[PDB]
Amino acid sequence: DPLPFFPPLYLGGPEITTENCEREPIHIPGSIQPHGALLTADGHSGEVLQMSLNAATFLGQEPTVLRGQTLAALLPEQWPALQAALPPGCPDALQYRATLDWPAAGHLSLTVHRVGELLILEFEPTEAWDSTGPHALRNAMFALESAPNLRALAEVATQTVRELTGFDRVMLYKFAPDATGEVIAEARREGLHAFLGHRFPASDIPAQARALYTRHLLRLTADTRAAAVPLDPVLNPQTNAPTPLGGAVLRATSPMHMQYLRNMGVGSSLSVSVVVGGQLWGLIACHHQTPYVLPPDLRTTLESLGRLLSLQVQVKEAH
Numbered sequence: 001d002p003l004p005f006f007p008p009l010y011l012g013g014p015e016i017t018t019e020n021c022e023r024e025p026i027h028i029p030g031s032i033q034p035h036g037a038l039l040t041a042d043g044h045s046g047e048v049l050q051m052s053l054n055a056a057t058f059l060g061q062e063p064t065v066l067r068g069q070t071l072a073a074l075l076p077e078q079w080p081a082l083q084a085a086l087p088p089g090c091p092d093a094l095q096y097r098a099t100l101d102w103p104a105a106g107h108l109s110l111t112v113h114r115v116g117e118l119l120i121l122e123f124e125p126t127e128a129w130d131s132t133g134p135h136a137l138r139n140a141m142f143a144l145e146s147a148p149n150l151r152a153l154a155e156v157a158t159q160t161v162r163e164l165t166g167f168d169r170v171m172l173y174k175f176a177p178d179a180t181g182e183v184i185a186e187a188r189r190e191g192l193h194a195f196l197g198h199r200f201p202a203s204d205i206p207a208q209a210r211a212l213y214t215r216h217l218l219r220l221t222a223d224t225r226a227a228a229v230p231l232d233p234v235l236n237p238q239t240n241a242p243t244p245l246g247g248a249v250l251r252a253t254s255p256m257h258m259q260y261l262r263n264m265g266v267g268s269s270l271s272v273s274v275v276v277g278g279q280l281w282g283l284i285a286c287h288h289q290t291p292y293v294l295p296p297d298l299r300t301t302l303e304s305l306g307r308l309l310s311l312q313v314q315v316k317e318a319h
């Protein structure tokens with residue numbers, strides 16, 4: 001049961017320290033990571049309500065010009081499909097995805113979800129060869145299925161994720177009932193220090209983070225030195241309140257966790273929740289030595305793999 005959050009910084013809330021970090025409102029940072037752009041829109045009208053300040057870089061026009069325009073006008077070939085895909089009251093983890101063309105090389109990937117009456121739209125560049133087929137997941141299921149026991153399953157799962165991603169380090173991090181954790185499997189680049197078998201305090205993944213990760217199963221930091229980009233306006237006009245960004249991979253990472261990653265020499269981080277019978281069982285935790293943007297289709301493959309692994313774990317634990 002997490003503590004109530006304090007207000008975010010931009011609402012005059014306290015600075016976050018090691019004494020109060022379980023109260024950081026990590027779901028409402030009012031900012032995004034700079035490798036993409038984000039807009040929010042009214043769920044009925046499609047009016048664009050908030051835009052990240054870097055929106056021009058990705059969309060080819062200025063935030064001051066795009067705000068107030070409707071998605072019906074801006075995205076005529078996707079707006080109807082988006083609407084149909086994310087009806088009022090759908091789960092906030094449900095996503096609509098489309099690939100758009102843009103002046104630059106490759107394409108823009110569009111990912112949308114719905115929170116309350118708001119649509120949250122993420123745009124990130126993707127290269128054409130950065131497609132991953134359903135084969136990646138399909139062929140991977142084979143070695144997961146043949147694993148004879150839980151620890152073998154964990155070992156194959158980390159190796160498979162490393163093969164799919166090329167990450168320098170992939171761990172299966174399992175939580176204990178006291179919320180401490182243990183690295184129970186690890187696939188890593190030759191020469192990297194092993195974390196295998198190491199245990200970590202509960203505070204390293206605080207309670208509000210673990211709660212969030214129970215609902216929104218994938219998060220990342222593409223560049224652990226990159227400054228966040230504000231949303232403008234920072235509050236949702238629908239509510240005059242902060243915008244929930246837990247469902248957006250572009251959400252700005254807690255600065256506290258960014259420092260933790262830099263202290264470990266990590267350039268890029270990504271993890272996927274393993275949720276068993278609705279409780280957070282563990283994470284597939286990935287590091288890269290340098291900044292790296294795992295493509296959207298591969299992220300989705302990894303989420304799917306976490307769900308598959310959840311079930312395989314749940315099968316084996318019953319035995």
Ligand SMILES: *C/C=C1/C(=C/c2[nH]c(/C=C3[NH+]=C(/C=C4\NC(=O)C(C=C)=C4C)C(C)=C\3CCC(=O)O)c(CCC(=O)O)c2C)NC(=O)[C@H]1C
Nearest residue numbers: 018021026200203204205209253254256257269270271285
């Ligand atoms: C006082 C606050 C603290 C801080 C908070 C914090 N931690 C996270 C998220 C993560 N922490 C992780 C921990 C590990 N990564 C590892 O490699 C290992 C061991 C080898 C551990 C124990 C992980 C995996 C995450 C998840 C995100 C990720 O995969 O990179 C958050 C939430 C970040 C966010 O989603 O915005 C917060 C606020 N950790 C502390 O140590 C204290 C200082």
